[PDB]
Amino acid sequence: PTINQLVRKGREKVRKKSKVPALKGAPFRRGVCTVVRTVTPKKPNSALRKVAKVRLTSGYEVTAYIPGEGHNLQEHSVVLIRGGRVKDLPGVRYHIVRGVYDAAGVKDRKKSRSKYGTKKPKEA
Amino acid sequence: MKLIWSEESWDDYLYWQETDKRIVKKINELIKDTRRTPFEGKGKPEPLKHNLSGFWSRRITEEHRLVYAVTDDSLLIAACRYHY
Amino acid sequence: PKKVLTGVVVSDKMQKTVTVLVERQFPHPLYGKVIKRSKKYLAHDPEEKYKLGDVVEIIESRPISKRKRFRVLRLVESGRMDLVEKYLIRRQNYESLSK
Amino acid sequence: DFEEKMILIRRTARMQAGGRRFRFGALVVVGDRQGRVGLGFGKAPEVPLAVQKAGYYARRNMVEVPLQNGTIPHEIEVEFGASKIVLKPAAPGTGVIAGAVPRAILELAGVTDILTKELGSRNPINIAYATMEALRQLRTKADVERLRKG
Amino acid sequence: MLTDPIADMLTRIRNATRVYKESTDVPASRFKEEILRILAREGFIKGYERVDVDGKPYLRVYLKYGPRRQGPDPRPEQVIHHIRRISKPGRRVYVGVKEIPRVRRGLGIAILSTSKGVLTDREARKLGVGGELICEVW
Amino acid sequence: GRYIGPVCRLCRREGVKLYLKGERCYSPKCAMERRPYPPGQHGQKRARRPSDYAVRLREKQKLRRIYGISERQFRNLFEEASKKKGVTGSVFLGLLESRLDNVVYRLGFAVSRRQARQLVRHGHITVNGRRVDLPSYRVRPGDEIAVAEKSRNLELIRQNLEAMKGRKVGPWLSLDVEGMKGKFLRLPDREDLALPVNEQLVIEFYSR
RNA sequence: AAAAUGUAAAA
RNA sequence: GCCGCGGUAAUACGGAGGGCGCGAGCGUUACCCGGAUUCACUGGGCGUAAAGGGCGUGUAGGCGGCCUGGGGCGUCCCAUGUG
Ligand SMILES: [Mg+2]
Ligand SMILES: [Mg+2]
Ligand SMILES: [Mg+2]
Ligand SMILES: [Mg+2]
Ligand SMILES: [Mg+2]
Ligand SMILES: [Mg+2]
Ligand SMILES: [Mg+2]
Ligand SMILES: [Mg+2]
Ligand SMILES: [Mg+2]
Ligand SMILES: [Mg+2]
Ligand SMILES: [Mg+2]
Ligand SMILES: [Mg+2]
Ligand SMILES: [Mg+2]
Ligand SMILES: [Mg+2]
Ligand SMILES: [Mg+2]
Ligand SMILES: [Mg+2]
Ligand SMILES: [Mg+2]
Ligand SMILES: [Mg+2]
Ligand SMILES: [Mg+2]
Ligand SMILES: [Mg+2]
Ligand SMILES: [Mg+2]
Ligand SMILES: [Mg+2]
Ligand SMILES: [Mg+2]
Ligand SMILES: [Zn+2]
C-alpha cells in the first residue's frame, strides 16, 4: 500500500479475544456446583473425565474440570474456578482449584502437590 | 436393562473366562459401563453398519472386540474375540 | 507573539465578518510524507472591506463573539477566486456521499 | 583438517510399491577459527556415510571471513530464496547471538561477537546456504578502495 | 512522464552495470550532474561528460567495474554493488545533521543536497549541515 | 541462603575439577579424583551429545558454583556488567572477584570461599579500619582487608595465614602475612584469573 | 454402450 | 501449553530411587509488551497459496520535464527562552 494509502487509510491495529472470560478478568471466581458428572473425551482418546457445571459469582454458568484422581464434589458444593481449557473436552474452558472451599485436595497425592492442593505429608 | 448373551457369545465369554482373566474383567467392566447408559461410555463406542448395522461395537484391546444391541431395557452381547 | 496566519476569504455573507481558509503542512509523525490539512477562521472585518477571493493575514485577537477570536490583519493579494473554487467544489462534492 | 560440526540430520524418504525406502541427509559446517568456513550437505543411504560426504563436500568449498577483532567488517542482509538473514558487527563482549544454524557456522569461522536475525523461511538448509553466501560477500576497507582506483 | 528523474538515473546505472556495459546516457540536469560528480569523485564511475543526442542534452556516464575472475561464471565483481534511492517524491526524507546515515559502516556513502551543496555523509558532517537525504551507495 | 549441602559432587556433574571443597579437593579425592563421572545412578553411561543449551547452562552453573553465590545475585551482577562500558565478559568476572568474601580467600585468610563467607560473616574481618560482615560487600581498589583483634589469635586464622608464608598472591593483590593485612591493588584482568570457564558462553546464556 | 458400494484398531 | 501419552513390558499416567532447576521461596491463574517482518515507517505482499476493482470517463486529493532569476513557507544551521 502506497505511503499515501497508509496516510489515508492506515494499518489495522489487532485485537485479542479473551480465550476465557472468568469474568472481570479476575484470576479466579468462586461459584457453586449445580451438576457433577463423567463425560467422555474427544476424537482419539477415550476415558471418563470428571467435570461440573458451575454458577459463578460473575453471573455466568460454565462447565469446569476437576483435576486429579477422584473428588468429593456433590451438588450444592462451592468451588473456586481457575481457568484453562482441555484440548480433549468440548466447551470446558475452566479448571477447578482443588483444596479451596468445598474442593478437597487429592487424597494420597505425593508428587506435584502445589497443584492438587495437598499439604506436605507428615512422614511418621 | 437385562443382560442377554447367546450361543456364540456365552461360548465366546467362557473361553475368555477360562483362558485369560485380563480380558474377562475388562469385558464385564464395560458391560457395567453400558448396562445403565449404552452407546456412550468406555472402550470407544461407535455405531456399526452393514454386516452388523443394528449392532454396536466397543473397542476393547484393538484386535478383540464386543458387539451388542440396545432395546429399551435388555442389552445383547454378540461376540468377544476377533476384529470385525 | 500573537499568532498570525494567512488564508483566503471564502464567505463574506456575514455582517462585519469573513471566513478565512488557512492551509498548513507538517510531516506525518509516522509515515514521513508531508500532508496538507486546513481550517476556517471567522475574522472581524468592522470595515467590511475584504471581499471574497482576497488572501489575507489573520492575527490572534481579543474575543469578538463566540467563534470570533481573530481580526483581519492586512490584504496580501486580491482576486484568488481560483482557490475559493477548490473550496466550493470540494464542498459541493458532499452531496455525492450521503443516502 | 578443521573443526567440523554438523547442523541437522534428517531422514527423508521415497515411495515404491511394497513400501517406502528411506535416505538420510546431514548438513555439516567446518572451519578453523581464523576465517575459513565450509558448508557441505550430503545424502546417502546411511547416517555415518552422510556426515562423511558432508565433510568431504564441506571442505571442497569455503569462505575468506575478514574477521576484525572477531567481529565483521560491516552488516549485510542476504536472501537465499525464501530465507533471509542479517548479520551485524558487535563490539567485543557481546557474543554470537544468532540462530542455531547461523551460529554453528559463525563459530567455526572464528566469529567472536556478532548480532543476527533470521527473517523469512527459517528452514535450516536455505538459511544455512544463505549465511555462507552472506559472509562470502563481506568486504574490508581494503577490498573497497581497491575497486575504486583511478 | 518521469515522476522522479534522479531515481531513474540511479536505476539506469544499476541496470547497465548488471550487463557490464561500458557506458550509458541520461537527460541532463545540473542536479543530475553534481550527483555523478561524486560517484566519480569517489571512484564509482570513471566519470561523465555532457554529450548531445539529437540536440537533446544527455550525460554519458562511464562505468567502473572490477577485475575478471576465475571459476565458473568469470563475470567481474562491481564497483557499485548497491545503489538505492532514499528520499522519494512520494515521501521526502530530510535529516538533521545529528542523524546522518553511517552507510555500510564507513565503507558506503550517502549523498544529500543541502543549502551548501550536494555533499556526502562525511562532507555533510564536516560542515555540520543536514538536508534531503538523496541516496545511499556502495 | 547460599547453596549448602553436598559439594564435591558438583565438581562431578560439571565434569571439571572444582576447588569448592578446600584442602580435601587437593588430596587424592576432590571426590572427583575417584569418581570423575557425574552423580546419580547414571553418572557412568555414555552421555548424549549435549545441546547448545546444555553447554551454555553447564558453563554458567560452573562459574556460579565456583564463587558459590545465589542465582539471584549472580544474575544481578551480570546485568550491571552489561551496564558499564567494558568488555562485559571480563568486567563481569572483574566484579565477581571484587566481593569481600572472595578477596578474603584470594588473599589467603581462608581455605575456601565457603569457609571464608563464614569468616567475613562472623565479623572476623575488617576493611580500612572498621569491620564488615557482608560477604557481598564490593571491595574497592586500595582497600586494606585485615582481621580484628578478637580474631587475630585464633587456631584457624593461624594455620591459614601460616601456610601462606611463602605463597604468592594474585597480581592484583598484596599481603602483609605478618600483620594479617593485604590490599586490593587494582581490578584483576582476564589473564590474572583463569577459572575453567568461558566468559563468552556465560554471556550467551543470559542472552537467550 | 449402461454396472453401485464397502467390511474399523493409524507405533 | 502445543505435537500428543495410556489396550502388559510407559523415561509422557500414579508411587519410589535417583536427577535437574531455583531457594524463604517455588509453582499456578489473569492481564500487558515479546517472540509476531502475524497491520510490515524501520519491516510484508496480491499469475496459481488470502489478495487487481468486469471496463471505461472523470471530481476531490496525491504525484510532476530542461534553464535562469526573485521570495525563502517546508528544509538545514547558530544563538537564545522553554522543556
Ligand atoms: Mg492456559
Ligand atoms: Mg482439537
Ligand atoms: Mg430400532
Ligand atoms: Mg522474497
Ligand atoms: Mg513464515
Ligand atoms: Mg535480550
Ligand atoms: Mg477404509
Ligand atoms: Mg510398565
Ligand atoms: Mg511430562
Ligand atoms: Mg514422568
Ligand atoms: Mg513416573
Ligand atoms: Mg527471541
Ligand atoms: Mg509488530
Ligand atoms: Mg513497508
Ligand atoms: Mg487465489
Ligand atoms: Mg476478482
Ligand atoms: Mg460492480
Ligand atoms: Mg482517467
Ligand atoms: Mg487532478
Ligand atoms: Mg518539479
Ligand atoms: Mg526557483
Ligand atoms: Mg523558511
Ligand atoms: Mg532549545
Ligand atoms: Zn572438590
mmCIF file of C-alpha atoms in Angstrom, chain F:
data_model
loop_
_atom_site.group_PDB
_atom_site.id
_atom_site.type_symbol
_atom_site.label_atom_id
_atom_site.label_comp_id
_atom_site.label_asym_id
_atom_site.label_seq_id
_atom_site.Cartn_x
_atom_site.Cartn_y
_atom_site.Cartn_z
ATOM 1 C CA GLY F 1 20.706 -18.599 51.555
ATOM 2 C CA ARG F 2 23.874 -19.907 49.874
ATOM 3 C CA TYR F 3 23.923 -23.444 48.438
ATOM 4 C CA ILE F 4 24.900 -25.673 51.405
ATOM 5 C CA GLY F 5 24.770 -29.438 51.036
ATOM 6 C CA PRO F 6 26.900 -31.946 49.050
ATOM 7 C CA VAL F 7 29.637 -30.134 47.055
ATOM 8 C CA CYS F 8 32.472 -32.427 45.814
ATOM 9 C CA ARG F 9 29.514 -33.750 43.777
ATOM 10 C CA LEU F 10 29.040 -30.644 41.625
ATOM 11 C CA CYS F 11 32.779 -30.916 40.996
ATOM 12 C CA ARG F 12 31.433 -34.122 39.415
ATOM 13 C CA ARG F 13 28.322 -33.078 37.481
ATOM 14 C CA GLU F 14 30.188 -30.142 35.953
ATOM 15 C CA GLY F 15 32.822 -32.610 34.770
ATOM 16 C CA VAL F 16 35.565 -30.145 35.709
ATOM 17 C CA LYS F 17 37.623 -30.334 38.902
ATOM 18 C CA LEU F 18 36.378 -27.749 41.376
ATOM 19 C CA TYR F 19 38.219 -26.353 44.360
ATOM 20 C CA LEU F 20 34.937 -25.787 46.135
ATOM 21 C CA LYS F 21 35.900 -28.082 48.973
ATOM 22 C CA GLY F 22 39.119 -26.719 50.443
ATOM 23 C CA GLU F 23 42.173 -28.820 51.229
ATOM 24 C CA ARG F 24 40.460 -32.175 50.630
ATOM 25 C CA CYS F 25 39.722 -31.267 46.971
ATOM 26 C CA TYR F 26 43.584 -31.216 46.836
ATOM 27 C CA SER F 27 44.415 -34.540 48.493
ATOM 28 C CA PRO F 28 43.725 -37.570 46.358
ATOM 29 C CA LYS F 29 39.932 -37.107 46.264
ATOM 30 C CA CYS F 30 38.055 -33.878 45.313
ATOM 31 C CA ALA F 31 35.664 -36.805 45.205
ATOM 32 C CA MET F 32 36.499 -36.139 41.578
ATOM 33 C CA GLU F 33 39.869 -37.850 41.778
ATOM 34 C CA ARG F 34 37.993 -41.100 42.457
ATOM 35 C CA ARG F 35 34.671 -40.952 40.538
ATOM 36 C CA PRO F 36 35.341 -38.466 37.671
ATOM 37 C CA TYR F 37 31.788 -39.136 36.470
ATOM 38 C CA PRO F 38 28.566 -37.178 37.268
ATOM 39 C CA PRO F 39 26.480 -38.063 40.378
ATOM 40 C CA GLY F 40 23.252 -40.043 40.473
ATOM 41 C CA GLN F 41 22.789 -43.668 39.449
ATOM 42 C CA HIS F 42 23.519 -42.940 35.762
ATOM 43 C CA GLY F 43 26.688 -40.907 36.099
ATOM 44 C CA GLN F 44 28.608 -43.649 34.327
ATOM 45 C CA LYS F 45 26.849 -44.177 30.978
ATOM 46 C CA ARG F 46 27.542 -42.643 27.549
ATOM 47 C CA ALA F 47 26.078 -39.155 27.930
ATOM 48 C CA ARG F 48 24.105 -37.816 24.959
ATOM 49 C CA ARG F 49 25.886 -35.202 22.831
ATOM 50 C CA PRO F 50 24.994 -32.017 24.828
ATOM 51 C CA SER F 51 22.608 -29.451 23.301
ATOM 52 C CA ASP F 52 23.798 -25.877 22.598
ATOM 53 C CA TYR F 53 21.664 -25.009 25.598
ATOM 54 C CA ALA F 54 23.184 -27.639 27.866
ATOM 55 C CA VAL F 55 26.574 -26.138 27.052
ATOM 56 C CA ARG F 56 25.779 -22.522 27.976
ATOM 57 C CA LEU F 57 23.870 -23.734 31.059
ATOM 58 C CA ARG F 58 26.566 -26.032 32.479
ATOM 59 C CA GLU F 59 29.267 -23.498 31.560
ATOM 60 C CA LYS F 60 27.352 -20.941 33.656
ATOM 61 C CA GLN F 61 26.393 -23.206 36.555
ATOM 62 C CA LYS F 62 30.114 -23.895 36.620
ATOM 63 C CA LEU F 63 31.094 -20.247 37.031
ATOM 64 C CA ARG F 64 28.363 -19.730 39.646
ATOM 65 C CA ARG F 65 29.097 -22.802 41.760
ATOM 66 C CA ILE F 66 32.714 -21.721 41.931
ATOM 67 C CA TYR F 67 32.079 -18.456 43.772
ATOM 68 C CA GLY F 68 29.150 -20.295 45.332
ATOM 69 C CA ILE F 69 26.644 -17.486 45.035
ATOM 70 C CA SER F 70 22.845 -17.123 44.617
ATOM 71 C CA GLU F 71 21.459 -17.256 41.078
ATOM 72 C CA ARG F 72 19.628 -14.082 42.031
ATOM 73 C CA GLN F 73 22.764 -12.081 42.842
ATOM 74 C CA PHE F 74 24.851 -13.720 40.140
ATOM 75 C CA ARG F 75 22.332 -12.535 37.541
ATOM 76 C CA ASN F 76 22.004 -9.065 39.102
ATOM 77 C CA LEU F 77 25.743 -8.714 38.664
ATOM 78 C CA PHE F 78 25.981 -9.691 35.035
ATOM 79 C CA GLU F 79 23.246 -7.152 34.338
ATOM 80 C CA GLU F 80 25.361 -4.366 35.838
ATOM 81 C CA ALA F 81 28.333 -5.537 33.810
ATOM 82 C CA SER F 82 26.398 -5.053 30.578
ATOM 83 C CA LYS F 83 25.531 -1.662 32.022
ATOM 84 C CA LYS F 84 29.065 -0.274 32.096
ATOM 85 C CA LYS F 85 31.425 0.285 29.189
ATOM 86 C CA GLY F 86 33.809 -2.618 29.333
ATOM 87 C CA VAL F 87 34.112 -5.950 27.543
ATOM 88 C CA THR F 88 31.279 -7.462 29.603
ATOM 89 C CA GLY F 89 32.623 -10.996 29.856
ATOM 90 C CA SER F 90 35.725 -9.578 31.550
ATOM 91 C CA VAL F 91 34.155 -6.854 33.686
ATOM 92 C CA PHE F 92 31.707 -9.488 34.911
ATOM 93 C CA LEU F 93 34.494 -11.652 36.256
ATOM 94 C CA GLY F 94 36.191 -8.468 37.418
ATOM 95 C CA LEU F 95 33.204 -7.562 39.587
ATOM 96 C CA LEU F 96 32.746 -11.138 40.817
ATOM 97 C CA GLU F 97 36.216 -11.035 42.305
ATOM 98 C CA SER F 98 35.586 -7.669 43.969
ATOM 99 C CA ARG F 99 33.323 -9.382 46.510
ATOM 100 C CA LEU F 100 34.595 -9.275 50.088
ATOM 101 C CA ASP F 101 34.021 -12.973 50.837
ATOM 102 C CA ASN F 102 36.081 -13.668 47.713
ATOM 103 C CA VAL F 103 39.057 -11.387 48.239
ATOM 104 C CA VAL F 104 39.360 -12.829 51.752
ATOM 105 C CA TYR F 105 40.027 -16.161 50.002
ATOM 106 C CA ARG F 106 42.050 -14.917 47.054
ATOM 107 C CA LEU F 107 44.019 -13.022 49.699
ATOM 108 C CA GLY F 108 44.728 -16.105 51.799
ATOM 109 C CA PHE F 109 42.853 -15.936 55.138
ATOM 110 C CA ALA F 110 40.580 -18.898 54.269
ATOM 111 C CA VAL F 111 40.949 -22.354 52.717
ATOM 112 C CA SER F 112 37.829 -21.987 50.526
ATOM 113 C CA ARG F 113 35.362 -19.241 49.669
ATOM 114 C CA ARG F 114 32.832 -21.344 51.541
ATOM 115 C CA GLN F 115 34.702 -21.146 54.841
ATOM 116 C CA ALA F 116 35.578 -17.519 54.004
ATOM 117 C CA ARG F 117 31.935 -16.480 53.793
ATOM 118 C CA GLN F 118 31.636 -17.818 57.337
ATOM 119 C CA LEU F 119 34.636 -15.669 58.197
ATOM 120 C CA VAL F 120 33.520 -12.320 56.769
ATOM 121 C CA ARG F 121 30.068 -13.034 58.086
ATOM 122 C CA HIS F 122 31.189 -13.720 61.664
ATOM 123 C CA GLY F 123 32.886 -10.311 61.801
ATOM 124 C CA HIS F 124 36.357 -11.831 61.884
ATOM 125 C CA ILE F 125 37.376 -9.491 59.066
ATOM 126 C CA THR F 126 37.637 -5.712 58.598
ATOM 127 C CA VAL F 127 38.298 -3.088 55.916
ATOM 128 C CA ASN F 128 40.143 0.222 56.058
ATOM 129 C CA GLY F 129 39.508 0.255 59.796
ATOM 130 C CA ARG F 130 36.001 -0.775 60.962
ATOM 131 C CA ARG F 131 34.738 -4.312 60.297
ATOM 132 C CA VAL F 132 32.278 -5.821 57.798
ATOM 133 C CA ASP F 133 30.101 -8.942 57.915
ATOM 134 C CA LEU F 134 28.604 -8.649 54.437
ATOM 135 C CA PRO F 135 30.035 -11.325 52.089
ATOM 136 C CA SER F 136 28.816 -9.439 49.006
ATOM 137 C CA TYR F 137 30.462 -6.126 50.007
ATOM 138 C CA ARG F 138 32.189 -4.598 46.944
ATOM 139 C CA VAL F 139 35.862 -4.246 47.799
ATOM 140 C CA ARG F 140 37.292 -1.202 46.013
ATOM 141 C CA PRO F 141 40.914 -0.541 44.896
ATOM 142 C CA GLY F 142 43.310 0.364 47.700
ATOM 143 C CA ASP F 143 41.250 -1.248 50.431
ATOM 144 C CA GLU F 144 43.014 -2.839 53.413
ATOM 145 C CA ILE F 145 41.482 -6.234 54.123
ATOM 146 C CA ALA F 146 42.648 -7.400 57.554
ATOM 147 C CA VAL F 147 41.444 -9.277 60.638
ATOM 148 C CA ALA F 148 40.221 -7.969 64.001
ATOM 149 C CA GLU F 149 41.828 -8.085 67.447
ATOM 150 C CA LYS F 150 39.461 -10.682 68.961
ATOM 151 C CA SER F 151 40.187 -12.724 65.808
ATOM 152 C CA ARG F 152 43.963 -12.345 65.345
ATOM 153 C CA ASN F 153 44.624 -15.080 67.922
ATOM 154 C CA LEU F 154 42.531 -17.936 66.517
ATOM 155 C CA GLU F 155 43.556 -21.510 65.748
ATOM 156 C CA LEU F 156 42.228 -21.446 62.212
ATOM 157 C CA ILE F 157 43.391 -17.914 61.453
ATOM 158 C CA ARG F 158 46.928 -19.034 62.400
ATOM 159 C CA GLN F 159 47.088 -22.217 60.302
ATOM 160 C CA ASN F 160 45.830 -20.398 57.222
ATOM 161 C CA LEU F 161 47.872 -17.181 57.331
ATOM 162 C CA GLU F 162 50.743 -19.551 58.124
ATOM 163 C CA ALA F 163 50.829 -21.800 55.067
ATOM 164 C CA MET F 164 50.548 -18.506 53.177
ATOM 165 C CA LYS F 165 54.083 -17.672 54.235
ATOM 166 C CA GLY F 166 55.958 -18.305 51.022
ATOM 167 C CA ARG F 167 52.899 -18.353 48.764
ATOM 168 C CA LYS F 168 52.261 -15.804 46.024
ATOM 169 C CA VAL F 169 49.067 -13.759 45.899
ATOM 170 C CA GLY F 170 47.276 -12.637 42.747
ATOM 171 C CA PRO F 171 48.999 -9.952 40.591
ATOM 172 C CA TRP F 172 46.199 -7.542 41.637
ATOM 173 C CA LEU F 173 46.715 -8.140 45.344
ATOM 174 C CA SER F 174 49.357 -7.701 48.051
ATOM 175 C CA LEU F 175 49.754 -9.263 51.500
ATOM 176 C CA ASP F 176 51.361 -8.479 54.861
ATOM 177 C CA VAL F 177 51.321 -12.055 56.230
ATOM 178 C CA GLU F 178 52.761 -10.640 59.456
ATOM 179 C CA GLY F 179 50.152 -8.063 60.446
ATOM 180 C CA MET F 180 47.470 -10.171 58.772
ATOM 181 C CA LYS F 181 46.695 -7.486 56.171
ATOM 182 C CA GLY F 182 46.503 -7.243 52.387
ATOM 183 C CA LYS F 183 45.365 -4.670 49.851
ATOM 184 C CA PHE F 184 43.082 -4.788 46.791
ATOM 185 C CA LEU F 185 45.632 -3.305 44.398
ATOM 186 C CA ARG F 186 43.588 -2.979 41.224
ATOM 187 C CA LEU F 187 40.781 -4.783 39.436
ATOM 188 C CA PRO F 188 42.004 -8.142 38.067
ATOM 189 C CA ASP F 189 42.181 -8.562 34.294
ATOM 190 C CA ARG F 190 41.162 -11.589 32.270
ATOM 191 C CA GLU F 191 44.630 -13.189 32.324
ATOM 192 C CA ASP F 192 45.255 -12.827 36.070
ATOM 193 C CA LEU F 193 42.273 -15.121 36.681
ATOM 194 C CA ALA F 194 41.997 -18.450 34.950
ATOM 195 C CA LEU F 195 38.794 -20.170 36.028
ATOM 196 C CA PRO F 196 37.876 -23.207 33.857
ATOM 197 C CA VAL F 197 35.119 -21.135 32.297
ATOM 198 C CA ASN F 198 34.388 -19.386 29.008
ATOM 199 C CA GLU F 199 33.094 -15.931 29.924
ATOM 200 C CA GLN F 200 31.670 -15.839 26.394
ATOM 201 C CA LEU F 201 29.361 -18.833 26.764
ATOM 202 C CA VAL F 202 28.031 -17.466 30.037
ATOM 203 C CA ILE F 203 27.147 -14.209 28.310
ATOM 204 C CA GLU F 204 25.474 -16.195 25.524
ATOM 205 C CA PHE F 205 23.366 -17.967 28.111
ATOM 206 C CA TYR F 206 21.842 -14.860 29.598
ATOM 207 C CA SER F 207 21.106 -13.699 26.078
ATOM 208 C CA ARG F 208 18.588 -16.390 25.239
#
